[PDB]
Structures are given as structure tokens and as C-alpha cells.
From Swiss-Prot:
Residues 8-155 form the Helicase ATP-binding domain. This is Serine protease NS3. The chain holds residues 1795 to 2273 of 3898 of the full protein. It comes from Classical swine fever virus (strain Alfort/Tuebingen). ATP binds at L21, A22, G23, K24, T25. It catalyses: Leu is conserved at position P1 for all four cleavage sites. Alanine is found at position P1' of the NS4A-NS4B cleavage site, whereas serine is found at position P1' of the NS3-NS4A, NS4B-NS5A and NS5A-NS5B cleavage sites; a ribonucleoside 5'-triphosphate + H2O = a ribonucleoside 5'-diphosphate + phosphate + H(+); ATP + H2O = ADP + phosphate + H(+). The record marks L458, S459 as: Cleavage. The lineage of its organism: Viruses, Riboviria, Orthornavirae, Kitrinoviricota, Flasuviricetes. Residues 173-365 form the Helicase C-terminal domain. Glycans are attached at N320, N403. A motif (DEAH box) lies at residues 113-116. Interacts with host TRAF6; this interaction inhibits host NF-kappa-B pathway. Interacts with NS5B; this interaction enhances RNA-dependent RNA polymerase activity. Interacts with protein NS4A. It is found in: Host cytoplasm. Multifunctional protein that contains an N-terminal protease and a C-terminal helicase, playing essential roles in viral polyprotein processing and viral genome replication. The chymotrypsin-like serine protease activity utilizes NS4A as an essential cofactor and catalyzes the cleavage of the polyprotein leading to the release of NS4A, NS4B, NS5A, and NS5B. Plays a role in the inhibition of host NF-kappa-B activation by interacting with and inhibiting host TRAF6. Interacts with NS5B to enhance RNA-dependent RNA polymerase activity.
Length: 459
């Protein structure tokens, strides 16, 4: 739209704008560049590398009159490319704060696409560029298809040992009318284990069930079908959706007792948006039915675990990513905030960067397949030796261990390490084995804990 372009094109350096109107990532920057001029540099940040590639490919074909650039690999030295530059946020994560600023200042406009995804690279770049925001023109964009009526239902929860008539059946803990099994059903469940258990039970009852891609084609090719899936992106002639309203997602637990940081998957409610995408699977080609649990959706994505992961990208430059997030969010108002949480996270982020990271640790983090390398960085403040904790199966300690590369790790044994950062399954092992986590062993960790106690107190 013309008015929006006029508004963005008149922005002065140091200004920020938030847009919701869904052309977006394609037609909005295109219109802006045609207005500002073809030779002016315009940057469009996209979360996924493959997504950035897709747009670049599409746009260069569609508009030959405008120049397009793709930035998803290695750093282009002295990059001065003229058209619209489509880049991943991770592309800019490679650069030092001075280098990043030098690069960023050259673009006339910077477009932040799909900021609601809140990936660690995304959170780090937003916080980092905001540091020199006075020098930029930043535009944050978001998009926050039913052709037939959707009938909505609240399915009651099936109680343990409840005897449903010949009229109802258990669909992932929800009481669904049996007459619904004559239709094409999609069931949303939080876990992979539940998708398999729900599918296998329905198959045993005689239903054409499958779980979640080529091995679903055998199910979906015959109707009626029932497909049990976790949060996903074919499903022909879909009639009904059964939504558990739940998802499995990483979460953080902050405490003044060490380990101060505890992370892992936890079952939680989906967001309003997620629920809308789940209900949106029906009413597209024919009428639909949507059965939801009594579970209330949350308003927004919990970015805390990703914020903690983002902190890594500020280590080399000695930047506190949480402080940067907070300062940025104040000016830009993109995300909801939990002030106690951000405070705690900032106290720990100061610890993370309080000292130069040991070369040994720096080198392990670079090469390891370990899913949370930041754990190594935080723990370096107390220990240099990574510890292999026994794996938890069902709710019991086993003799299985995760084998991550380049760790030079040691088995837990009876020796609990002084971890600053632990996983839910590491903490569980400690408790199940009747062992205790050590208390802070140095001024740094001691004061960090004292500061944490203090905040939870004034909370």
C-alpha cells in the first residue's frame, strides 16, 4: 500500500516502525526500493536460510528491473551490493560488533521479517543493532484462509477408568463422539510418544490410523483416515481436527540456589496463533469441525530459552545480550516482558561475560555437537571438565549416557560437579540418586546468587 510506503520512505535516521499489513517480505521492500531508488541498498532479514534463498529466487525472476542479493553463507568482504539484500540473521552473527555496525549503516532501510519467531540469532541481532539504532531506519514486519464454516466444540477430558458409551471414544485424552470416525480426522498431540500410542490404539480398534511422510500416503490415500501429529506444516479431504491444545517446548527455571539455570522440554499450552493454525487446517475446501480441550491458549511465544541461547552471540564482544534485548524491547515494544525473569537473566548474563572464556572451552563449543554449548561457557565459571550424567528413562536413572563430540567428558559417578547451568534430566539424576549440587565456590558465583536471592525477594 502507497500510504505505508510514503510513511516508511519519509523516516529519518534513528527511527523505528512496526508494520502488520500482510505483499509483506516481497512487495513492501520492492515498493520501498522503487520509491527510494534502484541503486539504494535495502536489507530484509529472514529467520531461515532456506526461506531467504526461496524469496531471493522468486523475486529475481519476478522483478528483473530490480537487483537482488542473497546473504546466507560466508561473509562477503566489503559488500556494497545495490538492490534488495535477502539475508538470514545468522549471516550477521559471524561479524564483530564494529564490523556489524559498519555493514548495517550502509543500508537505507532494514526490514525485520517475522520477528514473532524469536530465534536466538534473531534476538541477538535485534539487541545488537539496537545498540546503534540512532544510525538506522528499522522496520519490523509481521502477519499476526477459511472459505467454509467451522463448527467449534470443547471436548471434555476422559477420566481414568471412565466408561464411555458405544457413543464416544478416547482421542488423546479427549471424549470425542464415535460418529466422528466416519470422517477424515487430524489429531494434534504434544509428544511423539503420544502420536505413536494414540495411532497404535486407534489401529487396534479398527480405524485407518497413522502418525507423524511417504508412509502417511498409504493412510491418507483411503478414507476415512485418522492422522495423529505433533505441531506440523498434505491431508486430502480433511473434515475434523482434534486439538489437545498442548505442545512440548524448551523452558528455563531460574534460582538463587546453584545451578542457577535449569533447562529442558516441558508440556505447555499452545498460543492463540498456534491454535488458529491448528483450527485453520479445516474449512478450507469444504465445511469443517474443530474439537479443542478445556486448555486455554497463551498470548505469546515464551522467548526465555531462546534469549538464554542468544547470550552466546555476545561473548566475543563482551556484550550482555539480555541487557541489549531489554533496551531494544523498551524502544521497539515487539515482545511481552516478564521483568523478574529478564532481571535474573541479565544478572547471570553479566556473570557469563565477567571473564575471558578459556581457549579450551572456546574450542570445544566451536566443534561440539552438544545442543546447548552455552552450558559449557556458564559452567566454566566453576568447572572445566564436562560431566556425563546418566540418561533418564520413564522416570528412572539408567546406565545410558549421551555421547557429544569433543567434550573429553567424565561420567557423573557419585561426584556431582559444581554446575551453574544444568538440564532437567541432569537435576533429576542428582535427586533420584540422593546426591546434592555444590554451593557457589567463588566470589563471582556467590555474588551472582546473592543478587538473585535479592530479586526474588523484592518479587
Amino acid at each position: 500500500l502507497t500510504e505505508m510506503v510514503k510513511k516508511i520512505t519519509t523516516m529519518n535516521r534513528g527511527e523505528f516502525r512496526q508494520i502488520t499489513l500482510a505483499g509483506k517480505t516481497t512487495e513492501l521492500p520492492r515498493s520501498v526500493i522503487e520509491e527510494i531508488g534502484r541503486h539504494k541498498r535495502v536489507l530484509v532479514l529472514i529467520p531461515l536460510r532456506a526461506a531467504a534463498e526461496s524469496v531471493y529466487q522468486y523475486m529475481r525472476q519476478k522483478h528483473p528491473s530490480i537487483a537482488f542479493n542473497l546473504r546466507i553463507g560466508e561473509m562477503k568482504e566489503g559488500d556494497m551490493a545495490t538492490g534488495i539484500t535477502y539475508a538470514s540473521y545468522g549471516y550477521f552473527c559471524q561479524m564483530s560488533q564494529p564490523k556489524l555496525r559498519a555493514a548495517m549503516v550502509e543500508y537505507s532501510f532494514i526490514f525485520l521479517d517475522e520477528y514473532h519467531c524469536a530465534t536466538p540469532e534473531q534476538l541477538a541481532i535485534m539487541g545488537k543493532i539496537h545498540r546503534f539504532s540512532e544510525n538506522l531506519r528499522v522496520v519490523a514486519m509481521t502477519a499476526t484462509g477459511q472459505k467454509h464454516p467451522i463448527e467449534e466444540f470443547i471436548a471434555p477430558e476422559v477420566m481414568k477408568g471412565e466408561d464411555l458409551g458405544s457413543e464416544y471414544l478416547d482421542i488423546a485424552g479427549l471424549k470425542i463422539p464415535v460418529e466422528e470416525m466416519k470422517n477424515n480426522m487430524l489429531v494434534f498431540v504434544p509428544t511423539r510418544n503420544m502420536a505413536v500410542e494414540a495411532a497404535k490404539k486407534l489401529k487396534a480398534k479398527g480405524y485407518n490410523s497413522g502418525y507423524y511422510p511417504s508412509n502417511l500416503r498409504v493412510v491418507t490415500s483411503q478414507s476415512p483416515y485418522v492422522v495423529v501429529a505433533t505441531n506440523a506444516i498434505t491431508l486430502p479431504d480433511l473434515d475434523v481436527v482434534v486439538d489437545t491444545g498442548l505442545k512440548c517446548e524448551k523452558r528455563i527455571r531460574l534460582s538463587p540456589k546453584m545451578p542457577f539455570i535449569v533447562t529442558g522440554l516441558k508440556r505447555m499450552a499452545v498460543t492463540i496463533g498456534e491454535q488458529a493454525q491448528r483450527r485453520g487446517r479445516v474449512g478450507r475446501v469444504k465445511p469443517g469441525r474443530y474439537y479443542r480441550s478445556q486448555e486455554t491458549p497463551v498470548g505469546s511465544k515464551d522467548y526465555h530459552y531462546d534469549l538464554l541461547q542468544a547470550q552466546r552471540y555476545g561473548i566475543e564482544d563482551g556484550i550482555n545480550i539480555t541487557k541489549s534485548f531489554r533496551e531494544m524491547n523498551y524502544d521497539w515494544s515487539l515482545y511481552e516482558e516478564d521483568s523478574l525473569m529478564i532481571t535474573q537473566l541479565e544478572i547471570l548474563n553479566n556473570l557469563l561475560i565477567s571473564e575471558e572464556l578459556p581457549m579450551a572451552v572456546k574450542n570445544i563449543m566451536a566443534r561440539t555437537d552438544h545442543p546447548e554449548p552455552i552450558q559449557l561457557a556458564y559452567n566454566s565459571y566453576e568447572t572445566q571438565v564436562p560431566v556425563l550424567f546418566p540418561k533418564i528413562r520413564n522416570g528412572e536413572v539408567t546406565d545410558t549416557y549421551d555421547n557429544y563430540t569433543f567434550l573429553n567428558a567424565r561420567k557423573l559417578g557419585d561426584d556431582v560437579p559444581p554446575y551453574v547451568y544444568a538440564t532437567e534430566d541432569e537435576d533429576l539424576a542428582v535427586e533420584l540418586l540422593g546426591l546434592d549440587w555444590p554451593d557457589p565456590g567463588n566470589q563471582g558465583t556467590v555474588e551472582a546468587g546473592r543478587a538473585l536471592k535479592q530479586v526474588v525477594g523484592l518479587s
